Amino acid sequence: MALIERIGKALEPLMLVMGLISPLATMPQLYKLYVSHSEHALGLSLTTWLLYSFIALLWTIYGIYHKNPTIWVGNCLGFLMYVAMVVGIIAHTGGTY
Amino acid sequence: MALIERIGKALEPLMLVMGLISPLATMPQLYKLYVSHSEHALGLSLTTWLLYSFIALLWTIYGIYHKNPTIWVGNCLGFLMYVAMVVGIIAHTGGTY
Numbered sequence: 403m404a405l406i407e408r409i410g411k412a413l414e415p416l417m418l419v420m421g422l423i424s425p426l427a428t429m430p431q432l433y434k435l436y437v438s439h440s441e442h443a444l445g446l447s448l449t450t451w452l453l454y455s456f457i458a459l460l461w462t463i464y465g466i467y468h469k470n471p472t473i474w475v476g477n478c479l480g481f482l483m484y485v486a487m488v489v490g491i492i493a494h495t496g497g498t499y
Numbered sequence: 500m501a502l503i504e505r506i507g508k509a510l511e512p513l514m515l516v517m518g519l520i521s522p523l524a525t526m527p528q529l530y531k532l533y534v535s536h537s538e539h540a541l542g543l544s545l546t547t548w549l550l551y552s553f554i555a556l557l558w559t560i561y562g563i564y565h566k567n568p569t570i571w572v573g574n575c576l577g578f579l580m581y582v583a584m585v586v587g588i589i590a591h592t593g594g595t596y
């Protein structure tokens with residue numbers, strides 16, 4: 403399986419950066435929630451973003467404990483992004499699932 | 500830092516399960532997109548879920564390559580969940596960012 407190996411090996415020095423992509427990718431979602439499409443906030447699941455926040459927090463603690471920035475750097479940024487999603491969903495819906 | 504250590508150590512045997520939580524947590528978000536609140540799909544960022552899908556796919560390939568189910572199992576389920584988000588956003592908006 404040359405392709406799987408090629409990609410797998412190529413990702414090795416990029417793993418810390420990889421952890422930053424999804425948190426950074428959440429910025430357009432935050433933009434829609436807070437700025438451009440707040441009237442559609444009810445379409446967002448509070449449950450989903452709460453659990454994202456929870457898991458990101460756990461990985462952050464894990465990574466900090468083991469002095470592994472590849473883990474905690476991306477997940478710390480993630481945690482903040484997903485908490486911002488939680489706050490915004492509550493702010494524009496008054497509460498939902 | 501006893502608390503950080505306590506949590507960090509406790510998570511060690513749970514890391515595979517941890518990888519399943521966010522994908523499973525996406526189910527209420529998929530429910531809102533497809534079933535209960537499709538009229539608010541424009542509030543979802545296609546860019547965000549596309550990039551989630553992309554990163555999940557990369558981790559899946561990485562985990563498969565290194566025979567590490569703690570990595571690829573959760574990210575494979577994630578990949579499918581986030582692709583489902585992508586498809587649904589396109590289906591109910593006709594395209595957006």
Ligand SMILES: CCCCCCCC/C=C/CCCCCCCC(=O)OC[C@H](O)CO
Nearest residue numbers: 428429430431432433434438482483486596
């Ligand atoms: C605590 C964390 C909070 C901080 C993170 C929240 C970031 C919110 C904005 C991200 C910009 C990404 C989307 C780009 C928005 C560009 C705005 C603009 O240029 O105008 C609208 C544009 O035309 C669109 O169609």
Ligand SMILES: CCCCCCCC/C=C/CCCCCCCC(=O)OC[C@H](O)CO
Nearest residue numbers: 436481482483484485486487489490493494
């Ligand atoms: C007072 C603000 C201090 C922020 C430091 C928090 C530290 C924890 C990080 C959470 C990131 C997201 C924080 C939430 C961003 C606030 C957005 C907000 O509440 O806006 C509501 C809306 O504008 C009205 O309807």
Ligand SMILES: CCCCCCCC/C=C/CCCCCCCC(=O)OC[C@H](O)CO
Nearest residue numbers: 452455456459485488489492493494496497
């Ligand atoms: C364990 C990881 C998860 C941690 C999660 C951290 C966020 C906790 C919630 C903060 C809500 C603050 C939002 C304030 C919204 C402004 C007030 C408003 O507009 O109405 C909302 C009203 O309070 C309807 O309950």
Ligand SMILES: CCCCCCCC/C=C/CCCCCCCC(=O)OC[C@H](O)CO
Nearest residue numbers: 499525526527528529530531535579580583
């Ligand atoms: C390819 C991946 C696609 C498959 C994954 C997509 C899952 C979509 C539904 C998840 C259920 C979670 C939300 C629970 C919905 C319960 C429905 C119900 O009981 O009624 C509505 C309820 O009252 C609500 O308020």
Ligand SMILES: CCCCCCCC/C=C/CCCCCCCC(=O)OC[C@H](O)CO
Nearest residue numbers: 533578579580581582583584586587590591
């Ligand atoms: C024909 C279906 C076969 C599915 C196998 C795909 C394999 C890849 C996994 C992607 C998971 C999400 C797949 C997307 C689920 C389809 C939902 C859909 O298209 O619904 C549109 C809407 O109902 C109309 O407006």
Ligand SMILES: CCCCCCCC/C=C/CCCCCCCC(=O)OC[C@H](O)CO
Nearest residue numbers: 549552553556582585586589590591593594
């Ligand atoms: C690299 C990881 C990312 C991979 C991402 C995989 C998904 C690719 C998009 C499939 C769209 C299919 C959706 C079909 C929607 C039904 C038709 C419709 O309702 O209008 C949409 C129309 O095509 C407006 O473009």
Ligand SMILES: CCCCCCCCCCCCCCC
Nearest residue numbers: 448449452453499520523524527
């Ligand atoms: C493994 C997590 C699956 C999440 C499915 C639960 C959806 C129903 C909502 C109840 C939980 C809401 C409280 C926020 C955690």
Ligand SMILES: CCCCCCCCCCCCCCC
Nearest residue numbers: 423426427430545546549550596
């Ligand atoms: C590191 C990723 C940041 C994402 C910010 C880009 C938002 C603007 C939309 C352009 C990209 C849309 C194409 C889908 C990948």
